[PDB]
Write a protein that binds this ligand. Sequence first.
Ligand SMILES: NC(=O)c1ccc[n+]([C@@H]2O[C@H](COP(=O)([O-])OP(=O)(O)OC[C@H]3O[C@@H](n4cnc5c(N)ncnc54)[C@H](O)[C@@H]3O)[C@@H](O)[C@H]2O)c1
Ligand SMILES: NC(=O)c1ccc[n+]([C@@H]2O[C@H](COP(=O)([O-])OP(=O)(O)OC[C@H]3O[C@@H](n4cnc5c(N)ncnc54)[C@H](O)[C@@H]3O)[C@@H](O)[C@H]2O)c1
Ligand SMILES: NC(=O)c1ccc[n+]([C@@H]2O[C@H](COP(=O)([O-])OP(=O)(O)OC[C@H]3O[C@@H](n4cnc5c(N)ncnc54)[C@H](O)[C@@H]3O)[C@@H](O)[C@H]2O)c1
Ligand SMILES: NC(=O)c1ccc[n+]([C@@H]2O[C@H](COP(=O)([O-])OP(=O)(O)OC[C@H]3O[C@@H](n4cnc5c(N)ncnc54)[C@H](O)[C@@H]3O)[C@@H](O)[C@H]2O)c1
Ligand SMILES: Nc1ncnc2c1ncn2[C@@H]1O[C@H](CO)[C@@H](O)[C@H]1O
Ligand SMILES: Nc1ncnc2c1ncn2[C@@H]1O[C@H](CO)[C@@H](O)[C@H]1O
Ligand SMILES: [K+]
Ligand SMILES: [K+]
Lengths: 453, 448, 455, 453
Amino acid sequence: DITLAAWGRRELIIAESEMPALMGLRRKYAGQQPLKGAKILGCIHMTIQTGVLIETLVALGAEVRWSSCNIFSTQDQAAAAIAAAGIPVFAWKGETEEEYEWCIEQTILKDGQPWDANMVLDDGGDLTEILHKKYPQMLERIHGITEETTTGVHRLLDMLKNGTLKVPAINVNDSVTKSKNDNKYGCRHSLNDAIKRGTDHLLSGKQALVIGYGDVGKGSSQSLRQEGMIVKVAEVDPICAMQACMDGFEVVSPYKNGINDGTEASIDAALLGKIDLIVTTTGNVNVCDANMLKALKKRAVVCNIGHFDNEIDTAFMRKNWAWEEVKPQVHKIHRTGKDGFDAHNDDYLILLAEGRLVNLGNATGHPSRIMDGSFANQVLAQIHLFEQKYADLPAAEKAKRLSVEVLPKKLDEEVALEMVKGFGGVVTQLTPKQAEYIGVSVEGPFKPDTYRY
Amino acid sequence: AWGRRELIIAESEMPALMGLRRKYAGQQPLKGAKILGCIHMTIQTGVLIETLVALGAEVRWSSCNIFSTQDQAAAAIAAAGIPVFAWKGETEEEYEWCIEQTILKDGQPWDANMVLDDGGDLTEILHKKYPQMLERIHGITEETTTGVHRLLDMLKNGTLKVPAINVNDSVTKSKNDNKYGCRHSLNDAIKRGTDHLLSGKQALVIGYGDVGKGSSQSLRQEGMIVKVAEVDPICAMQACMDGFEVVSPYKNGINDGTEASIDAALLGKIDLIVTTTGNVNVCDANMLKALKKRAVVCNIGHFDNEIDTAFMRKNWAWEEVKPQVHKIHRTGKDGFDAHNDDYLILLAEGRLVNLGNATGHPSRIMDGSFANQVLAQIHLFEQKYADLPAAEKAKRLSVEVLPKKLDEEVALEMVKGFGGVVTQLTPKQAEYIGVSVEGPFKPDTYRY
Amino acid sequence: VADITLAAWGRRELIIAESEMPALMGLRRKYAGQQPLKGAKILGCIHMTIQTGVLIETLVALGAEVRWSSCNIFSTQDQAAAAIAAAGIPVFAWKGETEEEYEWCIEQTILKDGQPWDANMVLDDGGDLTEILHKKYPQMLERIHGITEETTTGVHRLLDMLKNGTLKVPAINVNDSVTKSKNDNKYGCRHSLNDAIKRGTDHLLSGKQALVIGYGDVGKGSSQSLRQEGMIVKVAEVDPICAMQACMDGFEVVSPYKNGINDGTEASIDAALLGKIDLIVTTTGNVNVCDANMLKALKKRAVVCNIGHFDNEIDTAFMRKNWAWEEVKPQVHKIHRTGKDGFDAHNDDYLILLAEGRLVNLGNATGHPSRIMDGSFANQVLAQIHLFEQKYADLPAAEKAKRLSVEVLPKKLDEEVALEMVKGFGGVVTQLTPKQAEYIGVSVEGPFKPDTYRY
Amino acid sequence: DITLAAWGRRELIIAESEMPALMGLRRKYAGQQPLKGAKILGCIHMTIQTGVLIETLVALGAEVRWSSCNIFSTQDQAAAAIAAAGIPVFAWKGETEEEYEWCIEQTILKDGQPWDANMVLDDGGDLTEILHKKYPQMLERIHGITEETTTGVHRLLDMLKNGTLKVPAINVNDSVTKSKNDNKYGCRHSLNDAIKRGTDHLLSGKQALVIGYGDVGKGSSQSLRQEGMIVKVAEVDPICAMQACMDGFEVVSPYKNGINDGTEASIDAALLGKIDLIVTTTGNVNVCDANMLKALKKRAVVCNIGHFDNEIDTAFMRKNWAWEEVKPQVHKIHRTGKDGFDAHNDDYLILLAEGRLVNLGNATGHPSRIMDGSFANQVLAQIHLFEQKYADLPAAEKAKRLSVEVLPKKLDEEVALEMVKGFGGVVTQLTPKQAEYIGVSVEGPFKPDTYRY
Ligand SMILES: NC(=O)c1ccc[n+]([C@@H]2O[C@H](COP(=O)([O-])OP(=O)(O)OC[C@H]3O[C@@H](n4cnc5c(N)ncnc54)[C@H](O)[C@@H]3O)[C@@H](O)[C@H]2O)c1
Ligand SMILES: NC(=O)c1ccc[n+]([C@@H]2O[C@H](COP(=O)([O-])OP(=O)(O)OC[C@H]3O[C@@H](n4cnc5c(N)ncnc54)[C@H](O)[C@@H]3O)[C@@H](O)[C@H]2O)c1
Ligand SMILES: NC(=O)c1ccc[n+]([C@@H]2O[C@H](COP(=O)([O-])OP(=O)(O)OC[C@H]3O[C@@H](n4cnc5c(N)ncnc54)[C@H](O)[C@@H]3O)[C@@H](O)[C@H]2O)c1
Ligand SMILES: NC(=O)c1ccc[n+]([C@@H]2O[C@H](COP(=O)([O-])OP(=O)(O)OC[C@H]3O[C@@H](n4cnc5c(N)ncnc54)[C@H](O)[C@@H]3O)[C@@H](O)[C@H]2O)c1
Ligand SMILES: Nc1ncnc2c1ncn2[C@@H]1O[C@H](CO)[C@@H](O)[C@H]1O
Ligand SMILES: Nc1ncnc2c1ncn2[C@@H]1O[C@H](CO)[C@@H](O)[C@H]1O
Ligand SMILES: [K+]
Ligand SMILES: [K+]
């Protein structure tokens, strides 16, 4: 379908007014054109907030090839707007696992020849793995790697220890305006909006359980508390559990004594018989096991917010229990049956997004004003690695240039200022008598690298 | 009489210390530790300094930070026969007499191994005046910020070959005091000092650090329309996200000193100004004389130079209602008839809240403060310094911050105190993230 | 009517919905066998939706027969009526939308072939049935026991009609009830406003500045929705008492006019306050509460929404000839404030409106969630049983002049609905002890509070 | 040490700007002198803000005598300010009840002869019953009685039902400035202050129980939630218990299945072993029983914001459990020991506000700016009753003139407008065209008499 081209154009115009920090590059850095001949490829979710990134990159003179990393992430009006520039590009939502690979494989080929790529944009680390294992000759003129999310970073870390890593990498996720802006406040806007779009229930007075208290979990739990639920949290890391205790929640283990023995007798079935909704944030293997999932209340909602679907055991339910569909990203799953179910039965569960990313699945995603801070960091990081020309310096210099890297604080503050001025806010200036007092210039970093904010 | 009663309570609202004690009892991993302690006596350290010496340990204590010394803890200790006074002497001449009768009891010096210095002032004399004793030490524990700068630069300058460990950078130390300590204490104190209605009016808070983050919620949760001022763009970014309004006392924020630079329109509509930063002259005198009538002035930022009190004293007169609350009148240096319109009010002295209205935070907040240092001590005594050869030490030299493992063991007992429970991992699951069932779950770059 | 085979989808659509109405189901289960409504004959005219079908299916389960239609023109969901019609109850709600059918539907509802029907109860949804019953078929008024109405506009008509003597059989209104008013007004918009905003514009709602005109019972719910998301909001009002509550709840009270008076000249507008507001919400029923001069002073790229009923609460007539209109999505619009004759797409000074003075909650939403609509329909089921026990119609002509009166819903029947809604959340209420009740002076069965208690 | 009266006056003299309506009362009726030396007797727990009313009454030309209502609310330093103004007072904190009742009868009799009285102020009906069972020849002289609180309205209605009530009264709880303003926000502002001032504990992450969800219940719950607590709500009325679910609170019952029958096995020992703070807000005879506190967890803290001490079975705690006083307002209650104890026990109890009322027993109490409207209507009701002089009416007409009435609309609207202007708000004036259309006068009653506000 091609109708959505005009609709996305109006949304982008309103989106541009909502991203003052990223739009500043189109006026300041459009003069010297820092990026010339930087052939790169990208992979993160495609929303209207992603469209302006490709727009500015094309405007500055760079060219990209792009793809989505999750099945239920694509916004059909955002993808059509980028295709309106005449590029033949294919991307959509709701495809099988085999079709998901077929799009990535089309990205890195041009009718027979691999792309002459120099840098990458990869979240999760999927496309990272294919290029190392399947096409060893792709990484021959690569300068760096730009990674957005946490799951990718762990993919990068172990590959340094084994020596398979061959090029330096930058971790944009560590910037303060990414993890303290996108992970925390991004999910708070989107979670409860996505939930109410699917079930269309009244959230006031119900009970919910959230697993994990990381940066995503904080915003998710706030997004549910601000609607009127009663929320409880579980955690393995005592620091996060302490934060949960001091933020006004209750902490509990879904297994007896907090020890997952493996048998059904170790499940605290009493407490799980009073829970109406489950959200999983951990991004780990099997944090919602099949033995747990058979002890929940009738007509209970299950959803996942982590990047991968290893959090809930959807494999067991497909082999034992029956499935029926209500609407996209909504399912009904009866118990004690495989061949069929009674039409008037009341013993069933309901699943959202099939255990995948729910807020991009059942909703639009994070607002345009939040991704502004997460994208200027990426664009600045792209420059900071291009001029170094890692493909050209001699191997005698390569052995010392391969080290951990991250953007400095001044480049982050130059984005934070333009974001703050977008709201109509004002930032004061220090007199010289005060600037010399604290050891910080009138213009420069006000905090060290150890500061946690 | 009453000084013996609070000890039972003090044992009762410290879950972590008693949990560690009952975990390590029987085994007694450490016996006859030679900690020479000098941190200020407080109501929480009473048991582990008087019970042990009553059973027969017979180890003396002292107070380095005399300004923070409280007579209540000393009176609680005084119920025993230990010759300790901790009196408010405040004179050096009589103080030297007390010192000499403590180091030696039976005529011989005691084999002190570690000094508990959190001031870093006497640590550069005596023990370094003759290096004979310096060959038998274990470590050092300092808490004050910018006070360890002396240790750090006389380490880099090359006059020390001893690594130092910092207790302040611990994760549990940051959130308990910087963020969660202020949110509980500010809202109670601001109302306790004046008994006003924090609803419908407008307030102005300066800075959006950890203290500012804690203060803004303590004011906004009651219905006060709060505004924030900040020089750091990142803190202002967090200010805009939490739902606050960011403004500037100066026209476009440029402080020229002339009267035509102050935006006097806003200052006449604002009902409160409070300072949370640590910078100098943040409350300027030019905007001080252009506030709305009958505003309240507050300060918590540990610095007395934030508000221009000198200009205020030389131009405006005070009224001493009591030594705990001060009123100030803007009519002139004297001559108020009975009650006028032009006046302001000050909390305690303008300097600190800790002048006597309230001390610190409730014991549950300060549970972790003393918990980290005792684990730092237990870690050092597990291994003997003289048994490690000096060869391979010089072959592998590095400086490392406190391991995350010791801090997690603090929070486990403290979460268990509230009634929660923490799930144990499975061997198959723990290999996906690359950390064992008990190992540190986060890298050192991760910001909690 | 379309396909009868598609009623199967409506069947399971009702079945899934049934899980979220505990009160209706509790009253259905408890009254089985006792049969309160045996022999009753009911007429209904409420707009046909999913929950409406629940109302019809729960009325017929207790032993009553019903005939149904729709008072409204545009409000009809064809899926739900098919299920009930297949179940075996005569239904006549469809989307004709033609003037010829409007005259045909009214007489056909009661008269089928020339022989009048033996009606005994009426449910009206605005007062249309009440008018035609007393004015055009007075011959059958002797057999009707009473009428129940849930809308205030029909209540005023009913009361004005009472004085003229045209009313002949009693009626009961339910709008003033607690479980009707608070659920329909406050919780209804608190859940829906911020959901409707975020589906329309997708804007980062936290950090921006909003204005709310009015603090009525709807206004409080609309104002609480925004403050929990992360905005800053302002309140404007004309009533001193209800304005005093906003100051205590943590707001700031302002006016769009200088000194509060409106002389009608350009100098009376406060531009120091309208220049920073990007969201304005009107929660009144009055006319022209937002004048054309406020629309010339608003900040660029602002959002306006109306939650009343009329296109006359805000000055759309001033924008109907001076400004240009452009459509963004199904129900959001752009209004460019640079002129009339043409406009480029890269304009800055435009404005954004939601549904222009019309319903915002039927255009792209399903309105109130199904749990609140439980409380509106479960109040009307108890009234019909109450009127049935009184037995007005069969009384002698002498005693018919003493029973006739207008009365509000009794407090005890009000408390019955609330009991079976708390148990839907798993809530367990406490039962009074005989020793305790006599100390307070209320019955163990209830009620517990006076009739003028301000809830 | 009476000399604290100077400090009391100095504290009192700076609270004038918080009460605009009470000031405007003088700025409107100083030129008429309505009381003209009328004799006003009353009873209420006195404070600085009641001292403002007392000094206003004295400045209006009258002379009053005043007694205390609660043991803990003497406020010797605050009462000394009025005591130095020639008005004798008889109160002493911590006094035995026999001395208090001997003091109460002291002011009734002056030189062996009953003092003159024209109006009476009352709190809780304690003085009214004394007047009705002692010197019954006193009621005929009194012209009117002004009283407050929900309980007092019930007492007056019961008296009217018995038919023995004379000298009609005026109900002030009906007015908005007293019901939905004083009752809700006074607790929300004072409860946390009092408990944190008395106990100094941390009020984040713990569990508490609040019984009843009326106006005072609707107010006291928010202060606990905003401090980070997780609290539970129970009540007997379905209507008010429904509101708790919609506000986001959780509903339980101390008894199994909701049926109480008086046996030890009928209570639910599960939830009671978790709650640590109990605030009871019903003002009844018995909301908790003897066996409720046997299942209570160790070291809980008790509270009472009702009207009487009946709501705790203090008689049960007196016969079997010994009391030993160690610290004012905070002392220990043992659970199993009698006439002796072991050296150490972990099973004692912590008490606050023994039997009597919190806040104004352990703190300053209700603040000044909130109680502007209450005292404003308190004075204006006396003015209104004075505008309907008695002892001039026809004898045959007196029988049919007696009726029950409530304060009209415009007076309360003017009081509210006075309070609005004190915060800086501006109220819009309705246009003449909008008066014709809606059908309300420009300044008259805007709400129908049945509005629930
Ligand atoms: N959808 C989005 O917009 C988005 C954004 C960022 C990150 N993510 C995803 O979120 C996930 C985690 O993000 P993060 O930055 O919050 O991670 P994080 O590392 O900061 O925190 C994860 C938490 O899980 C806890 N945990 C681990 N195993 C547990 C168990 N069995 N039970 C309870 N707690 C357990 C850890 O202690 C930790 O506190 C990743 O999969 C990442 O890709 C999604
Ligand atoms: N309350 C306590 O118990 C306690 C204990 C120790 C220290 N402190 C004090 O707390 C102070 C601040 O605490 P923190 O570490 O959370 O703050 P911080 O160190 O994180 O930063 C304070 C903020 O003030 C801002 N600031 C500086 N100059 C400013 C100016 N002219 N105008 C506006 N804003 C300005 C800075 O940008 C910064 O954001 C420290 O200076 C320290 O002395 C308090
Ligand atoms: N859309 C919905 O979901 C919904 C729900 C219930 C009711 N309603 C209807 O919409 C309206 C909602 O109002 P309500 O039920 O809360 O009644 P209400 O009478 O309590 O509200 C009237 C409010 O408007 C204020 N007001 C009146 N004229 C004003 C003016 N010129 N400027 C400023 N403030 C002014 C009054 O002070 C008062 O606060 C009613 O007409 C009601 O029938 C709509
Ligand atoms: N400072 C103070 O101490 C102070 C201040 C103001 C008011 N009050 C008290 O407030 C009370 C009035 O509150 P209100 O105005 O909300 O009146 P209210 O009658 O509406 O509230 C009392 C509530 O208790 C509930 N209830 C009755 N018996 C119960 C039981 N056994 N268990 C549980 N719930 C039960 C009722 O359903 C009702 O909701 C009075 O008792 C008065 O003494 C005290
Ligand atoms: N609207 C969005 N557009 C693009 N990426 C997004 C959006 N919302 C979240 N993400 C990214 O998705 C990743 C994992 O879900 C995160 O790194 C986050 O930055
Ligand atoms: N400090 C106070 N001063 C005056 N009235 C108060 C105070 N605290 C509570 N009240 C009132 O006392 C009554 C019951 O305590 C209520 O009407 C309440 O509003
Ligand atoms: K979005
Ligand atoms: K007081």
